Design a protein around this ligand. Structure first.
Ligand code: HEC
Ligand code: HEC
Ligand SMILES: [Ca+2]
Length: 309
């Protein structure tokens, strides 16, 4: 199969087991702590927002809103991307600009000092930090908190999508209609920006969605100065709405506004549908999640702050 070897030169399948990213070892104590952290709403000053609020594991790893809640409980500027397979993305933000997603996420509703004070006020967290970061005198630090969360994110991968079975050899994993969408995807230029393990998530490009249904289009930015990350398309079927602003709900419309003659990627209606069929084959196994049990607050725990004072 030439189609198959072509696909294997452009893409890679999601690893079957959680990866060690940047030397972040997956010990049980660290992954368990990270899981607690991920669902811990007390990392926010209101005690109501956790990573799971915006990267909902039951909703595709994101929040299914055009844009996430920003300051107060007002509309934020960006669509929250899925946390599923995110550890494989070299480009982590929508806009080309040194904080990482974890830090940016927490700071959206709180401060490092307050987060640390919160975690040290609960005996169980101190014990877990001590067990997850053995031999450190002050294990509960904002950096270690991030390392633990990151270790947990490494387990939030979605292996075994039909397409990955195909890449691994099962010529039958994709049907006729899906092989066309795949051929189109590799023939009409999509792979110039959306390739690798997540079919995207690696580079910024000078193209963004703008108001032009057919109310939007992706157009080159002035002088190519501002750039947007070409989104990782893996699990795209489950991460609507689309684009940096979440302005497009239809996956079909999303593919349409990216496949124009004026991009070097022209697609007619049927060709759009074929790509959509191929994109659906990118949905992998949602990782199983056992809800953690968080420890109760103590007298030293900073009190919740009202969102709307
Ligand atoms: C909503 C109020 C959020 C909370 C709470 C957290 N995150 Fe988030 N995250 C949010 C948005 C809107 C974005 C995109 C920001 C942009 O301008 O680009 C993100 C992004 C991430 C990513 C990057 C995705 C990637 O493809 O690499 C990750 C991995 C991530 N967020 C993780 C994360 C964690 C673990 C959080 C709790 C500590 C967390 N976020 C909170 C919105 C929100
Ligand atoms: C670089 C010049 C690109 C090429 C060629 C293609 N895409 Fe793309 N795509 C690119 C960027 C920079 C973005 C983000 C734009 C923004 O304003 O947010 C995207 C986005 C998409 C999406 C939405 C993804 C999401 O919301 O998670 C889809 C469905 C998509 N792109 C599809 C797609 C197809 C099918 C392409 C070939 C016809 C294609 N893109 C080419 C950059 C680039
Ligand atoms: Ca989305």
């Amino acid at each position: 199969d030439n189609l198959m070897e072509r696909a294997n030169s452009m893409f890679e399948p999601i690893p079957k087991y959680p990866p060690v990213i940047d030397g972040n070892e997956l010990t049980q104590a660290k992954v368990e702590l990270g899981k607690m952290e991920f669902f811990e709403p007390r990392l926010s000053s209101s005690h109501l927002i956790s990573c799971n609020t915006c990267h909902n594991v039951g909703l595709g790893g994101d929040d299914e809103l055009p844009t996430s809640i920003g300051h107060g409980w007002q509309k934020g500027p960006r669509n929250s991307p899925t946390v599923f397979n995110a550890v494989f993305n070299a480009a982590q933000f929508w806009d080309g600009r040194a904080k990482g997603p974890v830090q940016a996420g927490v700071e959206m509703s709180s401060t490092p000092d307050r987060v640390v004070a919160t975690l040290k006020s609960m005996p169980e967290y101190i014990e877990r930090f001590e067990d997850a970061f053995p031999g450190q005198e002050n294990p509960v630090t904002f950096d270690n908190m991030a390392v633990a969360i990151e270790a947990y994110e490494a387990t939030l991968i979605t292996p075994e999508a039909p397409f990955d079975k195909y890449l691994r050899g099962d010529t039958s994993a994709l049907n006729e209609s899906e092989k066309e969408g795949l051929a189109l995807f590799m023939d009409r230029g999509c792979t110039a920006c959306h390739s690798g393990v997540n079919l995207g998530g690696q580079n910024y490009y000078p193209f963004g969605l703008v108001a032009k249904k057919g109310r939007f289009s992706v157009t080159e930015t002035a002088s190519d100065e501002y750039v947007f990350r070409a989104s990782p398309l893996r699990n795209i079927e489950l991460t609507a709405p689309y684009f940096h602003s979440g302005a497009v709900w239809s996956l079909e419309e999303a593919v349409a506004v990216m496949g124009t003659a004026q991009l070097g990627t022209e697609l007619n209606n049927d060709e759009v549908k074929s790509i959509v069929a191929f994109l659906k084959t990118l949905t992998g196994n949602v990782p199983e999640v056992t809800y953690p049990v968080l420890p109760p607050s103590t007298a030293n725990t900073p009190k919740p702050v009202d969102m709307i004072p």
